[PDB]
Amino acid sequence: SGIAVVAVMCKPHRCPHIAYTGNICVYCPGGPDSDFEYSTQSYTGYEPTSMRAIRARYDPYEQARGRVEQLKQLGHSIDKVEYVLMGGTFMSLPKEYREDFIVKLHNALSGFNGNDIDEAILYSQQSLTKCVGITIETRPDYCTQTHLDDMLKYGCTRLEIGVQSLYEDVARDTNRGHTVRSVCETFAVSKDAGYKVVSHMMPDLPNVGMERDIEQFKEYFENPDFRTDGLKIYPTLVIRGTGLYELWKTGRYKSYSANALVDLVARILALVPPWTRIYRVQRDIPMPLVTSGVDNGNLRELALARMKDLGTTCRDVRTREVGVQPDQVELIRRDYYANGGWETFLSYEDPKKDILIGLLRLRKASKKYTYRKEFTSQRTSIVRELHVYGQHQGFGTLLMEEAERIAKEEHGSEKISVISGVGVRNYYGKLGYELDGPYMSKRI
Amino acid sequence: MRNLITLNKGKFKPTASTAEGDEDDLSFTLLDSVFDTLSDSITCVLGSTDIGAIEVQQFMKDGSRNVLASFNIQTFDDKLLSFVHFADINQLVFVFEQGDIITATYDPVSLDPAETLIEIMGTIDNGIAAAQWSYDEETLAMVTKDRNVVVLSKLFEPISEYHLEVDTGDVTALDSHEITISWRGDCDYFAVSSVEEVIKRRAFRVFSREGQLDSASEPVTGMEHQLSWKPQGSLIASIQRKTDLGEEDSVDVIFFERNGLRHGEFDTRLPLDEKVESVCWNSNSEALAVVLANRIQLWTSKNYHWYLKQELYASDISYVKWHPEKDFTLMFSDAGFINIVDFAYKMAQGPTLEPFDNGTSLVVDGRTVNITPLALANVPPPMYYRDFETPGNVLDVACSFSNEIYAAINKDVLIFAAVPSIEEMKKGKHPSIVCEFPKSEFTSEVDSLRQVAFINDSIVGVLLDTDNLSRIALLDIQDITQPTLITIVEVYDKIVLLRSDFDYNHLVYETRDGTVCQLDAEGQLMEITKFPQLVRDFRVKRVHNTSAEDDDNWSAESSELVAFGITNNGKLFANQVLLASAVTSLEITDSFLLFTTAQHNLQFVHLNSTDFKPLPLVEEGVEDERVRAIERGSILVSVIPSKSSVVLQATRGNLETIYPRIMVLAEVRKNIMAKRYKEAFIVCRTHRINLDILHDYAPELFIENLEVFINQIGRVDYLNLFISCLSEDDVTKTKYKETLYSGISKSFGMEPAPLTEMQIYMKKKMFDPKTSKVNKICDAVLNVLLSNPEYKKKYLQTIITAYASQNPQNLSAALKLISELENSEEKDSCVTYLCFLQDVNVVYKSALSLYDVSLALLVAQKSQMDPREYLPFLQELQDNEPLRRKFLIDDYLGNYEKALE
Numbered sequence A: 001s002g003i004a005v006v007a008v009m010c011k012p013h014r015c016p017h018i019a020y021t022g023n024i025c026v027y028c029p030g031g032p033d034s035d036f037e038y039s040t041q042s043y044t045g046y047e048p049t050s051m052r053a054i055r056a057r058y059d060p061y062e063q064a065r066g067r068v069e070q071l072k073q074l075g076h077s078i079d080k081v082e083y084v085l086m087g088g089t090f091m092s093l094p095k096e097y098r099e100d101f102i103v104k105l106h107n108a109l110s111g112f113n114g115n116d117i118d119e120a121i122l123y124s125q126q127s128l129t130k131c132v133g134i135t136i137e138t139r140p141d142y143c144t145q146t147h148l149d150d151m152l153k154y155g156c157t158r159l160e161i162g163v164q165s166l167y168e169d170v171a172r173d174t175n176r177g178h179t180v181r182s183v184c185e186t187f188a189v190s191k192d193a194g195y196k197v198v199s200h201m202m203p204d205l206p207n208v209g210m211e212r213d214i215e216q217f218k219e220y221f222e223n224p225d226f227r228t229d230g231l232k233i234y235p236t237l238v239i240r241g242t243g244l245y246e247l248w249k250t251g252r253y254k255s256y257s258a259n260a261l262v263d264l265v266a267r268i269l270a271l272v273p274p275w276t277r278i279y280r281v282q283r284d285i286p287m288p289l290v291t292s293g294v295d296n297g298n299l300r301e302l303a304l305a306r307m308k309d310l311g312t313t314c315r316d317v318r319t320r321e322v323g324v325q326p327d328q329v330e331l332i333r334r335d336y337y338a339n340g341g342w343e344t345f346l347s348y349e350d351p352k353k354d355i356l357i358g359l360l361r362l363r364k365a366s367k368k369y370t371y372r373k374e375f376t377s378q379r380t381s382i383v384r385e386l387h388v389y390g391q392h393q394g395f396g397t398l399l400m401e402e403a404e405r406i407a408k409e410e411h412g413s414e415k416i417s418v419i420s421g422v423g424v425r426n427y428y429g430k431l432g433y434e435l436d437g438p439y440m441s442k443r444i
Numbered sequence B: 001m002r003n004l005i006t007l008n009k010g011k012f013k014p015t016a017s018t019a020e021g022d023e024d025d026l027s028f029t030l031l032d033s034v035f036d037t038l039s040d041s042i043t044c045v046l047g048s049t050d051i052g053a054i055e056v057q058q059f060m061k062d063g064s065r066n067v068l069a070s071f072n073i074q075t076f077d078d079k080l081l082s083f084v085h086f087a088d089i090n091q092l093v094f095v096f097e098q099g100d101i102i103t104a105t106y107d108p109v110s111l112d113p114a115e116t117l118i119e120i121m122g123t124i125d126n127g128i129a130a131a132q133w134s135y136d137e138e139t140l141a142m143v144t145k146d147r148n149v150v151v152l153s154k155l156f157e158p159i160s161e162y163h164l165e166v167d168t169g170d171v172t173a174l175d176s177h178e179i180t181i182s183w184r185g186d187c188d189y190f191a192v193s194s195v196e197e198v199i200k201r202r203a204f205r206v207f208s209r210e211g212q213l214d215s216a217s218e219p220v221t222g223m224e225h226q227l228s229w230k231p232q233g234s235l236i237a238s239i240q241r242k243t244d245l246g247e248e249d250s251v252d253v254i255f256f257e258r259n260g261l262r263h264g265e266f267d268t269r270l271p272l273d274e275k276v277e278s279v280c281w282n283s284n285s286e287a288l289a290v291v292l293a294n295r296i297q298l299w300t301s302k303n304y305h306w307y308l309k310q311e312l313y314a315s316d317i318s319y320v321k322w323h324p325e326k327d328f329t330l331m332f333s334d335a336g337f338i339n340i341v342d343f344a345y346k347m348a349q350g351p352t353l354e355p356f357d358n359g360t361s362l363v364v365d366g367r368t369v370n371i372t373p374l375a376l377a378n379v380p381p382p383m384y385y386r387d388f389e390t391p392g393n394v395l396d397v398a399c400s401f402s403n404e405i406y407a408a409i410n411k412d413v414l415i416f417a418a419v420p421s422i423e424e425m426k427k428g429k430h431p432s433i434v435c436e437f438p439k440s441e442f443t444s445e446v447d448s449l450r451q452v453a454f455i456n457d458s459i460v461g462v463l464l465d466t467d468n469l470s471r472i473a474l475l476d477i478q479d480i481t482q483p484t485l486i487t488i489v490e491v492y493d494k495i496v497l498l499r500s501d502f503d504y505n506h507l508v509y510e511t512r513d514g515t516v517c518q519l520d521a522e523g524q525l526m527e528i529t530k531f532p533q534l535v536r537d538f539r540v541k542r543v544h545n546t547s548a549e550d551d552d553n554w555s556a557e558s559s560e561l562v563a564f565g566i567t568n569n570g571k572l573f574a575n576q577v578l579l580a581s582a583v584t585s586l587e588i589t590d591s592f593l594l595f596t597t598a599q600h601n602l603q604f605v606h607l608n609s610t611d612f613k614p615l616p617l618v619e620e621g622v623e624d625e626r627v628r629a630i631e632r633g634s635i636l637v638s639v640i641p642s643k644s645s646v647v648l649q650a651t652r653g654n655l656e657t658i659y660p661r662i663m664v665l666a667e668v669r670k671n672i673m674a675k676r677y678k679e680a681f682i683v684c685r686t687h688r689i690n691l692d693i694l695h696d697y698a699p700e701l702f703i704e705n706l707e708v709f710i711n712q713i714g715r716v717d718y719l720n721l722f723i724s725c726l727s728e729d730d731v732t733k734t735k736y737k738e739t740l741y742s743g744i745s746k747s748f749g750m751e752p753a754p755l756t757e758m759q760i761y762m763k764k765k766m767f768d769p770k771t772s773k774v775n776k777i778c779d780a781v782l783n784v785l786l787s788n789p790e791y792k793k794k795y796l797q798t799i800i801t802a803y804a805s806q807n808p809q810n811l812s813a814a815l816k817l818i819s820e821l822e823n824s825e826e827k828d829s830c831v832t833y834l835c836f837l838q839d840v841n842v843v844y845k846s847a848l849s850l851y852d853v854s855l856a857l858l859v860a861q862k863s864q865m866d867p868r869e870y871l872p873f874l875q876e877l878q879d880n881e882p883l884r885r886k887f888l889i890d891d892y893l894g895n896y897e898k899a900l901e
Ligand SMILES: C[C@H]1O[C@@H](n2cnc3c(N)ncnc32)[C@H](O)[C@@H]1O
Pocket: A027, A028, A029, A042, A161, A162, A164, A200, A201, A202, A234, A235, A236, A237, A238, A283
């Protein structure tokens, strides 16, 4: 089996930082103020997801339903689907459009027909084709206390922030619109609300040279400010109508050769700690559109082969699973400090074959943060995801048995709380948990 | 979560040999000194300023001495700037403020002076302001006093030359206007600090190996002129004294990067009217030292937090230099005394016995002592757990055997801290400061404080240090407040480490020679051994000899004190046996020795013997019981035997508590011989060992006391997990080989070959008669819970698995007792369990064979078959006569002889 990934795009709109800056990001292609016909921001219209959107005319009930039943004409036999939103700055849209968007995302699985956001998720809880999560990408200045609890009502569990640089000059000179000391503060309120925080990083930006790229990513996992649970490596591509195309035209910006770039990402993956995953090493842009930058579309395996003859194994949690039988497994945990709280990473491992079975995240709720009403009347601890691959069945109930014993004793908590998605709310109701708002919690 | 300690401090005054050879030299001020990587010696220069005279002397580390050059210069009043020794072309060079590159050359075999040439090799017009050599000793970067920077080579011929040009930051009212030069760790870059006015502003410029401008700095305010460079590739590490009023009125240490931008800060907890004179990075990284007027303090960093692990005290500092090749050793000069000091790591922790375990770690963060008992709260290295504050700048810490009493020393004061109980420690109480026992009652003013230790929480041993010798002090801390003295025992050498032994019933130490001695509570010195080389970290315990059956082969039991240490380059010794040769960390335990190998492993040594032989080499398919893979340098921090857990710490700074296989089995084997079977069973499930250790370790104790195992394992969902997942081979002789009573030099037993296609059929070539392990115990399970009437009430579901798990596959007796179940619908709940662990048409043909047709109906509806096929066939069998049916039922199955009867 597995998890079905259905990607939808919202209405093509303008970012909200075009007003007070004067324009959008230097490297961003596409959008309404471009030459691509009827394309969402940061897209070209020639992508296999972005071609299903234009034929659907961005109708969320008809875009998602055509994608779901397409994947079962191939015969994947889907019953657990995780939505992901992309394109634009979805939380910058008007409030009466965003809530009606998410409602028809749920109606394509349940069959309920209505417009109340507070009632559509209740019908979606007893659905049989169920939603395990919704990924919504946004900007770091749109994760305030007003926006983070709107995502809890929508059913969102994972959110993605474009960081793309850890230097102050790069976020200024590329007209990014925020500061790097501001994104390290909104990571803290997001992880204490219970979200899986994934960030985006971009090598080969302007004015960041070859050597500055490797101390950029060494800092990203040594500093306890960031230490997130995921990355999407997006190397810089020069596109036709972008802002950096004129820098390529007048000879004031040149890119990497495709022997030093694959050497770079063979060193970046060497520093990846075992609690984070690398979703993408490059993005799906058809190479006839791109002028300079990445030549081919096979940078993933060319990076794994380049670290074969360096002796270094990429210990990535996207790489280290069954995809070879364990025959045995141990229980280990890892403890790191991330941006205000004590994160732990429980997993079942084999140190010989280097393969993972299950994993879990858990966080002590800090005191400088955590504005939520349910997490203030007493000292609580937040479990953030459970993710078991595939007897080989009781790995879920073992990770919940251990995360609860470690919360009463070592955290000293009176309540444990889950950020389970709507379709998987019934798996926790059997284990003694009860719903209180967005969370599925229990007094210890 | 690791500290720093001082290994050795040896001072001496380099005096310059007068021509008349007596005392009462005029001044002969000490100028500078360097190291020698090719001779294990120290080259220092002496001179005078009134008369233009110089001196240079080489100091080998055996008492010997040589005089290399002694001449006179013109331009009398001046000072020296740089001095380096090549020690391969036996050439000495000099750089003065007056623009002189005076050189000298000696001969290696005839060490007499005055057979030296002196040339000039260049003269700088109008003075030189600063000068510095490269780490590759190939390139000079001197800055002339007329505001002009030049670059030379080894042969002193010029390479290039560059003249310079000229919110905005201010300059504070404490700095002087000199120029500092600092190189990149791998050269071809250097940096030059200077002052411009546009308002007056101090900045710097970054140059290449050639005289080429690359970048300039940001205008930040109050650059105090101190400059350096982290030799890894970044982090210029300036100061920025902040003169802004308010709360933000401290003095920091600010970092840069080579394009001139700002990246990173930390706070240096100092008063504002104090002069920072230097800052120094070590050879590789991870140790920053700032230099005050009379005081040197060292800064380290882990997870972006800086620590003040150590601090040195003197009277008047002039220059501080790190060592090029080996790290954590540095020299300075205090009123003419060159003194070498060398450093190492240490993890001040508590006991390791199974009672009083509560594994406690103690780290130093400047003016506080941070605590983390990893058996109560598994706090990551950035945060901590119930610290306590001190009126001092703690140098070293130690805890007691009940780890309720905490000692932390400072300069000229010694401070105790206590806890009422270990469970009221957990409720939220920080340790309370009790008494501040000064440094005037047990020693004079002339002694110093380095280390401290405990013994059975009643006597506090304190490592003192004299300038020539070293002695330790004993104290009495019964009635903790108002302590009293015990006699000041003394030993005639220089102590390197001081530490309490395992069980905390004695103290051990180590001199410079490697001699390890043992000291009791009333001061009786007992020598243990002498290591072949100087070990920087060691542990001591009294191992015991224990045979197989615990008092068998019993004649003249014995014991011997064994020392366990790792030297600098990585040789693990155990009374001059050289166990391994690449070790980087260790920690001992009762019944186990633990150490990491720097081939990215973590291997174990038992401690029930006394013979020690060198270890068999580990190879890529080891899989014994004693090797587990480590990532890229995770080291030991603590061992918790009462939880069977080992905590580690990686390079990036997290923790990782692995649960090693050698000690998880070491506790479940203790419980099943203690006949517990319930504390043993829970550990068998959470750690996911093969679940049949309960039988395959005591195969005759299991069947003999099997009724206890059913009563103690009172749940139905676990007994169905025991019987179902049984193998056919023995796990004690294949995987869990029990390598305890097995020696030391036994080779690591590799994994078996993959059983390929011809070996699969040759594995099941010998099928299973009435002697296999499965049919022995599956009968034995049925032997007890088919006797009582109440055992087949609660545990009726595990009877279904006990039959259906056999090699004869006795399904006919499972499907017989289902038909007698008359109370409720439990025929439905049992057949849906029997058709999961077996194919349904296999169950359907067996339910059809015991001649009852109403039972075969319920099996067929679970079988995804077409109901138009079997249901008409079941209808013809219903209405006939019974003997008419038993012929019709056997033609379907293939029981032709049974049909014919
Ligand atoms: C919306 C996402 O698209 C990525 N993104 C935006 N522009 C580019 C480009 N030229 N190349 C690669 N990735 C890009 C951003 O980093 C953001 O994470």
